[PDB]
C-alpha cells in the first residue's frame, strides 16, 4: 500500500513501467484474474499513477528497476 512518485519532467513515455508492474500484469496474464485495477497508464506521454489512494502497490521495485532513465522514486515510509 506504498506510494510511488513519477518525475514527469524526465518521463519519456517508454511504457516499460506499465508493462512491468506485476499489479498491472494481473488482468491479462493470470488465470481467473483477481483484481483488474492498474497503477500506471501513459497519458499524454508521461506515466500517470491511477493508484491515487495508495492501495495496490506492493513495494516490489519491478517498476523502479524497469524505467531506463531512473525517474520513479519508491517511498517505503507511510505517506
Amino acid at each position: 500500500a506504498f506510494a510511488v512518485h513519477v518525475n514527469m519532467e524526465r518521463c519519456t513515455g517508454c511504457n516499460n513501467c506499465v508493462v512491468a508492474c506485476p499489479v498491472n500484469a494481473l488482468e491479462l496474464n493470470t488465470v481467473n484474474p483477481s483484481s483488474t485495477d492498474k497503477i500506471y497508464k501513459v497519458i499524454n506521454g508521461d506515466a500517470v499513477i491511477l493508484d491515487v489512494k495508495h492501495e495496490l502497490c506492493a513495494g516490489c521495485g519491478i517498476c523502479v528497476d524497469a524505467c531506463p532513465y531512473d525517474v520513479i522514486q519508491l517511498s517505503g515510509q507511510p505517506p
Partner: protein, 321 residues
C-alpha cells in the same frame, strides 16, 4: 511540557537505531537492515503492536533508501525484547545501557527458539559444501587453507597425514561449527552434507502452497526475497521436450522453506501463496504470553491486492478462514 523521555529514531548507516533517552538510562532497539528478511514474525509477535512491515521487495532489492524493511513506533515500543528473541535471523538487538542485555531472558520469562545446530566433528571432513550452500553467512569453518586458492596451510602433502607408505587413518585438519544465532534452519547444509554430520531442526512446521496459475509472470520478488532460497523459477524446457506441457511460473521447495513469511509479505499478487505454521519448536518452558504469541503466529495468511488506504505505508494480508 516535559522533555526528558526523548524518543529518537536515527538511521546510522545501515542500522536503524531506535532510542529512548533518560538522564542516565537509555534503551536502544537496533535493527540491522542488512540481515532483515522482511518476514513479519516480528510484527506478529510484538506484544505492544508497534512493529509494522514496509516495502519488503524494494528494500530487499536495494531500490528503496528512505526506509527499512520494518518500521517500529519507538513511542509505543516497551523494550521487552520479545521481537529480539522471536526473530529467526537475528537482525534485531536490544541494548539497555550500552550492552546487549535481555532482562526477560535474564529472569527466564520467555522461551527461545531451539534451532538445535551441531556438527559432529568426528564425521565432518572439512568439505566446503556446507559453507557453499548456506543461504545466510552462518557456517564458521576454521580450516587451514592449503594450496587451493592460497599458500599452503601446512602443505599439499600434509593435508593428508602421510609417513614419508600409507595414509594413517584420518586427517580432519581444523574445526567447523554453525553460528547458532545466524542459522535459519533452512537445512540446505544438512540435506546436502556429504557425511550426514549436521543436525539442524526447523523452528516452524506447517505447509506452504504456490498456485502457479496466478503469478503474473515477471515478478520474481518472492524469489529475490526468500531467505532460504526455497523458491525457484522452474526452468523452461527446450523444444522437442516440452511435450504439450508449457511450464510453471513459480514453485517452492518444501524441504528448504522455513515458513518465514517474506514471500507472502512481498508478493504483489492476490493469493498465489498460502502460509500456515503449525508448531514452533522451543526450549524454555512456556508462558501465557507465549500461548498468545503461538495463536498469533499460527493463523493462516495469504497476499492481498487493494488493502485499505488508512494504513497506507505498510502491509496488510488476508485472513484465511
Amino acid at each position: 511540557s516535559t522533555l526528558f523521555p526523548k524518543y529518537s529514531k536515527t538511521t546510522d548507516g545501515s542500522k536503524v537505531i531506535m532510542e529512548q533517552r533518560l538522564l542516565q538510562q537509555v534503551n536502544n532497539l537496533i535493527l540491522d537492515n542488512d540481515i532483515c528478511t522482511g518476514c513479519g514474525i516480528c510484527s506478529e509477535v510484538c506484544p505492544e503492536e508497534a512493529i509494522s512491515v514496509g516495502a519488503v521487495g524494494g528494500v530487499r532489492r536495494g531500490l528503496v533508501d528512505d526506509a527499512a524493511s520494518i518500521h517500529v513506533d519507538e513511542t509505543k515500543c516497551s523494550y521487552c525484547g520479545v521481537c529480539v528473541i522471536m526473530c529467526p535471523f537475528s537482525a534485531l538487538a536490544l541494548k539497555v545501557d550500552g550492552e546487549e542485555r535481555l532482562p526477560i531472558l535474564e529472569k527466564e520469562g520467555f522461551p527461545t527458539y531451539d534451532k538445535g545446530t551441531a556438527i559432529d566433528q568426528d564425521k565432518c571432513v572439512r568439505c566446503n559444501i556446507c559453507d557453499d550452500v548456506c543461504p545466510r553467512d552462518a557456517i564458521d569453518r576454521d580450516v587451514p587453507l592449503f594450496e587451493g586458492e592460497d599458500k599452503e596451510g601446512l602443505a599439499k602433502g600434509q593435508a593428508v597425514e602421510l609417513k614419508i607408505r600409507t595414509v594413517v587413518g584420518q586427517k580432519k585438519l581444523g574445526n567447523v561449527n554453525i553460528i547458532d544465532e545466524d542459522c535459519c534452519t533452512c537445512r540446505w547444509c544438512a540435506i546436502n552434507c556429504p557425511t550426514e554430520a549436521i543436525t539442524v531442526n526447523k523452528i516452524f512446521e506447517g505447509e506452504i502452497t504456490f498456485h502457479a496459475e496466478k503469478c503474473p509472470g515477471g515478478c520474481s520478488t518472492c524469489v529475490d526475497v526468500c531467505p532460504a532460497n526455497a523458491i525457484y523459477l522452474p526452468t523452461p524446457k527446450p523444444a522437442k521436450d516440452m511435450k504439450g506441457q508449457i511450464e510453471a511460473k513459480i514453485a517452492v521447495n518444501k524441504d528448504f522453506c522455513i515458513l518465514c513469511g517474506a514471500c507472502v509479505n512481498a508478493c504483489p499478487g492476490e493469493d498465489i501463496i498460502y502460509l500456515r505454521r503449525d508448531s514452533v519448536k522451543i526450549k524454555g518452558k512456556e508462558t501465557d504470553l507465549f500461548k498468545k504469541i503461538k495463536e498469533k503466529l499460527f493463523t493462516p495468511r495469504t497476499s492481498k491486492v487493494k488493502e485499505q488506504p488508512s494504513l497506507a505505508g505498510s502491509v496488510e494480508l488476508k485472513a484465511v478462514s
